[PDB]
Write a protein that holds these residues in place. Structure first.
Motif, PDB file in Angstrom:
ATOM      1  N   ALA A 113       0.936  -0.745  -0.099  1.00  0.00           N
ATOM      2  CA  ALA A 113      -0.368  -0.219  -0.047  1.00  0.00           C
ATOM      3  C   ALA A 113       0.908   1.180  -0.197  1.00  0.00           C
ATOM      4  O   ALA A 113       0.330   2.577  -0.721  1.00  0.00           O
ATOM      5  N   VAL A 114       1.362   0.860   0.740  1.00  0.00           N
ATOM      6  CA  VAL A 114       3.175   2.533   1.031  1.00  0.00           C
ATOM      7  C   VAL A 114       3.427   2.566  -0.680  1.00  0.00           C
ATOM      8  O   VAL A 114       3.409   3.463  -0.748  1.00  0.00           O
ATOM      9  N   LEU A 115       3.932   1.230  -0.931  1.00  0.00           N
ATOM     10  CA  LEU A 115       4.341   1.481  -2.906  1.00  0.00           C
ATOM     11  C   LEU A 115       3.447   2.042  -3.965  1.00  0.00           C
ATOM     12  O   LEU A 115       3.457   2.931  -4.192  1.00  0.00           O
ATOM     13  N   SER A 116       1.699   1.421  -3.687  1.00  0.00           N
ATOM     14  CA  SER A 116       0.578   2.394  -4.106  1.00  0.00           C
ATOM     15  C   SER A 116       1.070   3.725  -4.207  1.00  0.00           C
ATOM     16  O   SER A 116       0.317   4.698  -5.131  1.00  0.00           O
ATOM     17  N   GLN A 117       1.156   4.323  -3.059  1.00  0.00           N
ATOM     18  CA  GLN A 117       1.074   5.907  -2.730  1.00  0.00           C
ATOM     19  C   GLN A 117       2.378   5.798  -3.527  1.00  0.00           C
ATOM     20  O   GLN A 117       2.171   7.242  -3.559  1.00  0.00           O
ATOM     21  N   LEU A 118       2.976   5.642  -2.988  1.00  0.00           N
ATOM     22  CA  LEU A 118       4.385   6.675  -3.574  1.00  0.00           C
ATOM     23  C   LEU A 118       4.717   6.456  -5.377  1.00  0.00           C
ATOM     24  O   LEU A 118       4.592   7.019  -5.767  1.00  0.00           O
ATOM     25  N   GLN A 119       3.715   4.990  -5.842  1.00  0.00           N
ATOM     26  CA  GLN A 119       3.294   4.901  -7.207  1.00  0.00           C
ATOM     27  C   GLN A 119       2.866   6.140  -7.750  1.00  0.00           C
ATOM     28  O   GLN A 119       2.495   6.940  -8.689  1.00  0.00           O
ATOM     29  N   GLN A 120       1.312   6.299  -6.873  1.00  0.00           N
ATOM     30  CA  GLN A 120       0.524   7.462  -6.889  1.00  0.00           C
ATOM     31  C   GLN A 120       1.111   8.763  -6.794  1.00  0.00           C
ATOM     32  O   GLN A 120       0.689  10.102  -8.432  1.00  0.00           O
ATOM     33  N   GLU A 168       3.849  11.259 -21.539  1.00  0.00           N
ATOM     34  CA  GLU A 168       4.473  10.377 -20.772  1.00  0.00           C
ATOM     35  C   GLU A 168       4.017   9.410 -20.069  1.00  0.00           C
ATOM     36  O   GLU A 168       4.342   7.941 -19.552  1.00  0.00           O
ATOM     37  N   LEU A 169       2.778   9.491 -19.258  1.00  0.00           N
ATOM     38  CA  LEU A 169       1.997   8.332 -18.527  1.00  0.00           C
ATOM     39  C   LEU A 169       1.995   7.481 -19.461  1.00  0.00           C
ATOM     40  O   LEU A 169       1.941   5.898 -19.368  1.00  0.00           O
ATOM     41  N   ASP A 170       1.070   8.040 -20.714  1.00  0.00           N
ATOM     42  CA  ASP A 170       0.400   7.221 -21.712  1.00  0.00           C
ATOM     43  C   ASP A 170       1.865   6.184 -22.221  1.00  0.00           C
ATOM     44  O   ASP A 170       1.737   5.202 -22.462  1.00  0.00           O
ATOM     45  N   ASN A 171       3.030   6.826 -22.543  1.00  0.00           N
ATOM     46  CA  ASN A 171       3.876   5.589 -23.262  1.00  0.00           C
ATOM     47  C   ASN A 171       4.423   5.095 -21.882  1.00  0.00           C
ATOM     48  O   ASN A 171       4.628   4.054 -22.376  1.00  0.00           O
ATOM     49  N   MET A 172       4.094   5.434 -20.592  1.00  0.00           N
ATOM     50  CA  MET A 172       5.240   4.411 -20.375  1.00  0.00           C
ATOM     51  C   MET A 172       3.842   3.530 -19.810  1.00  0.00           C
ATOM     52  O   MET A 172       4.201   1.777 -19.944  1.00  0.00           O
ATOM     53  N   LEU A 173       2.560   3.439 -19.421  1.00  0.00           N
ATOM     54  CA  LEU A 173       2.078   2.230 -19.750  1.00  0.00           C
ATOM     55  C   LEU A 173       2.028   1.334 -20.818  1.00  0.00           C
ATOM     56  O   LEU A 173       1.527   0.461 -21.104  1.00  0.00           O
ATOM     57  N   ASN A 174       2.263   2.050 -22.191  1.00  0.00           N
ATOM     58  CA  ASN A 174       2.085   1.263 -23.503  1.00  0.00           C
ATOM     59  C   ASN A 174       3.241   0.309 -23.263  1.00  0.00           C
ATOM     60  O   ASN A 174       3.577  -1.106 -23.436  1.00  0.00           O
ATOM     61  N   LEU A 175       4.835   0.813 -22.675  1.00  0.00           N
ATOM     62  CA  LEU A 175       6.078   0.244 -22.827  1.00  0.00           C
ATOM     63  C   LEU A 175       5.494  -1.006 -21.559  1.00  0.00           C
ATOM     64  O   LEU A 175       6.568  -1.910 -21.300  1.00  0.00           O
ATOM     65  N   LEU A 193       4.254   9.205  -7.685  1.00  0.00           N
ATOM     66  CA  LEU A 193       4.480   9.604  -8.722  1.00  0.00           C
ATOM     67  C   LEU A 193       3.973   9.630 -10.433  1.00  0.00           C
ATOM     68  O   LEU A 193       3.888  10.181 -11.546  1.00  0.00           O
ATOM     69  N   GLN A 194       2.818   9.414 -10.256  1.00  0.00           N
ATOM     70  CA  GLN A 194       2.051   9.041 -11.382  1.00  0.00           C
ATOM     71  C   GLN A 194       0.887  10.968 -11.780  1.00  0.00           C
ATOM     72  O   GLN A 194       0.367  10.873 -12.332  1.00  0.00           O
ATOM     73  N   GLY A 195       1.359  11.477 -11.147  1.00  0.00           N
ATOM     74  CA  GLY A 195       1.094  13.222 -11.248  1.00  0.00           C
ATOM     75  C   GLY A 195       2.179  13.648 -12.441  1.00  0.00           C
ATOM     76  O   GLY A 195       1.783  15.356 -12.670  1.00  0.00           O
ATOM     77  N   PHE A 196       3.051  13.137 -13.038  1.00  0.00           N
ATOM     78  CA  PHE A 196       3.575  13.557 -14.975  1.00  0.00           C
ATOM     79  C   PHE A 196       2.823  13.654 -15.570  1.00  0.00           C
ATOM     80  O   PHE A 196       1.837  12.795 -15.997  1.00  0.00           O
TER      81      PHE A 196
END
Lengths: 290, 261, 367
Positions: free
Chosen positions: A266-273, A282-289, A275-278
């Motif tokens: 859950a802490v890792l999910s919060q950390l990802q969230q 870039e987020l779409d490209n990262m999702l495709n990758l 970093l999800q403000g990018f």
């Protein structure tokens, strides 16, 4: 003290002029090597001159070995043994001043020769095959052994300076001697692979290719060291798309990262969230990758 | 004043530095200065048992400085005695030659003073006679100045020895020593009486050497006899006939002079 | 002059530099009374290898060609064989200008001195010794440290080459002894005297110090020098280094460093013997006695540093070392008072004894 100044003066004058005034005979390269080794025991400037000549000597030896390999001097074992023993004793007497400069000379020579041969020969996953064909040779393998011995002497004393020199030479000459860096990383997983990953991500941030070579080296060093590399990747991710790019381009690192993600949030999910403000693209490209 | 305290402190410091190095103790004693002779003597005593080249050089320098400054001290006499003892080693190596050369390097004044002191302190009559004979033989000038007194001195020495008979090896050795002194200096002219006395002494010495009494209480030539209270090997005399020949040569040099003979 | 500069301006291979140097040396030897910008730049490039743009690179690596330049300079000096020419060269090379060029030239001169010592070049050694005598404290210390490092790191037994050079060349030996006395003090572990350096210092004190005293007597020198411009007598420096050596070893555990203690004791004994001989020779005349002829005003700081280092655990663990250092300091003070090194009287010795730890024997020694 039978060695008088007259003999030394005559020898150095004859060498500087380039032609013997009395004998008038072009001495063999073995005689030049013998004279250089005798001077190296005493004169550090002559030791530097000996290293300068050894650049060409090792170039000739490597070219001869490559010619022998492709088509298919004398006493290959004895001369290499003598040079190795002389360098070992020279390092043993006072490693502080002699080990760094000799290691730098050897690594610069290896990098320059690899740069020249990567394009001028038919002999040059992929980095694994490069490692096989390069370690397969004899003279280059012994030179790599000498460099590994020099570093093992230098790791305890000055690890940070050696790492800094290695990464500077890498950023200057990346597609040339990385397989030796891969071997060194395989022998010494943790700090070496951590610094390689740091260099790769730093270059990636500078650009806003080194990354491909870094991934190849990490994959090569994964054998006997994959667990340490995975731990380093997890530590880097703990603190961003550079890890994902490396995982995508490196199948061995991809499997290691898959195992790590399967392990572990859950802490890792919060950390990802966080970093999800990018930006969205870039987020779409990262999702495709992904 | 506090001279005794400083001397004791210097001696203690020199002694304590012996285990570390004799050179350090000698250097400290020299650098102390002030009472230089006392410090030099302390350093010499500390390095007396030492045998290092640096210690020997330091001891020699200290001894030379003491000789230059101190007019009289037992250290010089002790050094002379040690040198003489070292010279008395076996002559089957270069060590004896080196010791003799080192002993000879000392000034003649110190040796003469030590010999005079030894002669004065020698209560024994035989020791006094030996000292007088050595003094007479060392320098022909004393014998020349005395003139006819050599015979009287020899008679007094024989009387002091408590052995009237001259057949003893000691008398022959003394006569030979007296003859070598005259042989060494060929410019010492003597009158008829002195020449007659010397001839009589030489004849008596030759008679004693030819045969001696049996009293008790590649080639070479020699003889045998019995010494008076001493080992026969102690009488180190070589070629008495050659000594007589040299005496005759010196006599001839003064006046410009079948078978073989 | 102009032709040499014109030739040197163009082309990378300065093969004509040797001819220009030989011509300049010949002109100096034959026209010393009669003897620019171009020559200064050429000399800087040859020795210091510092280009006009100092902030820029110093003519690339300048290492492979440095050996050739040093060999050319050595050959030119050997061909010179002139006191005036060698003195002019030394003065030009060692002349300060307020920049790193002087330091680089001094370093090149030290390297040439080491090369000459390897070749036992008598005139080159004499010129180098004269240049060192005209060099600052930092330059002399750097040259001595570089020479000691080269003589210790070349190969085992390399001190024999240094000893042979000292025996053959007395001027170089005296210069090395003076440099060692001024620099080697063992105040800090970075400046720790070496075993080979200690042996060389002992060998120099054995016979070379007499040559230094003879040179000092031949031409008078000032009672004091600015920052110790190669002080002639090495007794004070050797004594200070030996005193600090036991305290440094104790601070750095007794038999772990035993060679250093023995070497320091031998060096102290040699220095004391040399000082005693010099005193016995010179006290009869009025040549010396004010403050001797050497000290460089560096003994007090080294002694203070050694005392501070030995203060930690002085009575408990380093009691023997503290006593040895105190005895050595008392002997040095007594020698200084007897040799006339004291400024006015033994008041400074009394003050030092009062500030020093308990030592009753010094009071009797002074009186």
């Amino acid at each position: 003290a039978p060695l008088s100044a007259q003999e030394l003066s005559q020898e150095i004058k004859a060498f500087l002029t380039g032609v013997d005034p009395i004998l008038g005979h072009q001495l063999s390269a073995r005689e030049h090597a013998r004279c250089g080794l005798l001077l190296l025991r005493s004169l550090p400037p002559a030791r530097a001159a000996v290293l300068d000549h050894l650049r060409g000597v090792f170039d000739e030896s490597v070219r001869a070995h490559l010619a022998a390999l492709d088509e298919t001097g004398p006493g290959l074992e004895d001369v290499v043994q003598e040079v190795q023993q002389v360098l070992s004793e020279f390092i043993r007497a006072n490693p502080k001043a002699w080990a760094p400069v000799i290691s730098a000379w050897s690594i610069d020579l290896m990098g320059q020769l690899s740069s020249t041969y990567s394009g001028q020969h038919q002999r040059v996953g992929a980095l694994n095959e490069l490692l096989q064909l390069w370690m397969g040779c004899r003279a280059t393998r012994t030179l790599m052994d000498i460099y590994v011995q020099c570093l093992s002497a230098l790791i305890g004393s000055c690890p940070d300076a050696c790492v800094d020199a290695l990464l500077d030479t890498s950023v200057q000459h990346s597609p040339h001697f990385d397989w030796v860096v891969a071997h060194i990383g395989s022998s010494f997983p943790g700090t070496i692979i951590s610094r390689v990953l740091s260099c790769g991500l730093k270059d990636f941030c500078v650009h806003g290719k080194i990354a491909s070579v870094v991934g190849i080296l990490g994959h090569l060093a994964s054998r006997h060291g994959d667990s340490i590399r995975r731990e380093l990747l997890r530590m880097f991710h703990d603190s961003v798309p550079f890890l994902l790019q490396l995982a995508v381009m490196s199948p061995a690192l991809l499997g290691t990262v898959s195992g790590e993600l399967v392990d572990c949030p859950a802490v890792l999910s919060q950390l990802q969230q966080h970093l999800q403000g990018f930006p969205r693209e870039e987020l779409d490209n990262m999702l495709n990758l992904a | 004043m506090s001279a005794q305290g400083d001397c004791e402190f210097l001696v203690q410091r020199a002694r304590e530095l012996v285990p570390q190095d004799l050179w350090a103790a000698k250097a400290w004693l020299i650098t102390a200065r002030s009472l230089y002779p006392a410090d030099f003597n302390i350093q010499y005593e500390m390095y007396t048992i030492e045998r290092n080249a640096e210690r020997t050089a330091t001891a020699g320098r200290l001894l030379y400085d003491m000789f230059v400054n101190f007019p009289d001290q037992p250290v010089v006499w002790r050094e002379i005695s040690i040198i003489t003892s070292a010279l008395r080693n076996d002559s089957q190596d270069k060590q004896t030659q080196f010791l003799r050369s080192l002993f000879e390097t000392l000034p003649g004044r110190v040796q003469c003073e030590m010999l005079l002191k030894v002669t004065e302190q020698c209560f024994n009559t035989l020791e006094r006679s030996e000292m007088l004979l050595l003094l007479l033989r060392r320098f022909p000038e004393t014998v020349v100045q005395h003139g006819v007194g050599l015979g009287e001195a020899l008679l007094e020495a024989e009387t002091i020895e408590e052995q009237e008979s001259p057949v003893n090896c000691f008398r022959k050795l003394f006569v030979c020593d007296v003859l070598p002194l005259i042989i060494n200096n060929h410019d010492v002219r003597l009158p008829a009486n002195l020449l007659y006395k010397y001839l009589n002494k030489a004849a008596e010495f030759y008679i004693n050497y030819v045969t001696r009494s049996t009293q008790i209480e590649s080639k070479r030539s020699s003889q045998k006899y019995i010494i008076e209270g001493l080992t026969e090997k102690s009488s180190q005399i070589v070629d008495p006939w050659e000594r007589l020949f040299k005496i005759l040569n010196v006599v001839g040099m003064r006046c410009e002079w079948y078978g073989d003979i | 002059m102009s032709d040499i500069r014109h030739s040197l301006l163009r082309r990378d291979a300065l093969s004509a530099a040797k001819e220009v140097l030989y011509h300049l040396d010949i002109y100096f030897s034959s026209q010393l009374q009669s003897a620019d910008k171009g020559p200064v730049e050429l000399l800087e490039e040859f020795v210091f290898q510092v280009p006009k743009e100092r902030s820029a690179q110093p003519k690339r690596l300048n290492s492979l060609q440095e050996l050739q330049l040093l060999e050319i300079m050595c050959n030119y000096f050997q061909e010179q064989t002139k006191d005036s020419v060698r003195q002019i060269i030394f003065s030009s090379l060692f002349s300060p200008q307020g920049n790193k060029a002087d330091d680089s030239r001094m370093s090149l001169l030290g390297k040439l001195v080491s090369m000459a010592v390897a070749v036992c070049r008598i005139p080159v050694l004499e010129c180098a010794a004269s240049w060192l005598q005209r060099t600052p404290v930092v330059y002399c210390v750097r040259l001595a440290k570089a020479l000691v490092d080269d003589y210790c790191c070349l190969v085992p037994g390399s001190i024999q080459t240094l000893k042979q050079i000292f025996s053959a060349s007395p001027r170089f030996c005296c210069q090395f002894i003076t440099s060692v006395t001024a620099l080697y003090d063992l105040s800090s572990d970075d400046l720790i005297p070496p075993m080979d350096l200690l042996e060389m210092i002992v060998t120099w004190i054995f016979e070379d110090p007499r040559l230094i005293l003879i040179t000092f007597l031949n031409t008078p020198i000032a009672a004091n020098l600015p920052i110790g411009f190669l002080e002639l007598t090495p007794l004070v420096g050797l004594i200070r280094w030996c005193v600090k050596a036991p305290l440094a070893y104790k601070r750095k555990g007794v038999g772990m460093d035993r060679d250093s203690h023995l070497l320091y004791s031998k060096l102290h004994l040699s220095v004391l013997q040399v000082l005693m001989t010099l005193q016995l020779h010179l006290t009869e005349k009025n040549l010396y006695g004010r403050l001797g002829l050497i000290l460089f005003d560096h003994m007090v700081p080294l002694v203070e540093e050694i005392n501070r280092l030995a203060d930690e655990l002085n009575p408990l663990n380093a009691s023997q070392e503290i006593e040895l250092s105190l005895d050595r300091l008392a002997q040095a003070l007594q020698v200084a008072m007897a040799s006339g090194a004291l400024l006015c009287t033994r008041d400074d010795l009394r003050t030092l004894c009062s500030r020093l730890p308990h030592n009753n024997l010094l009071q009797l020694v002074i009186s």
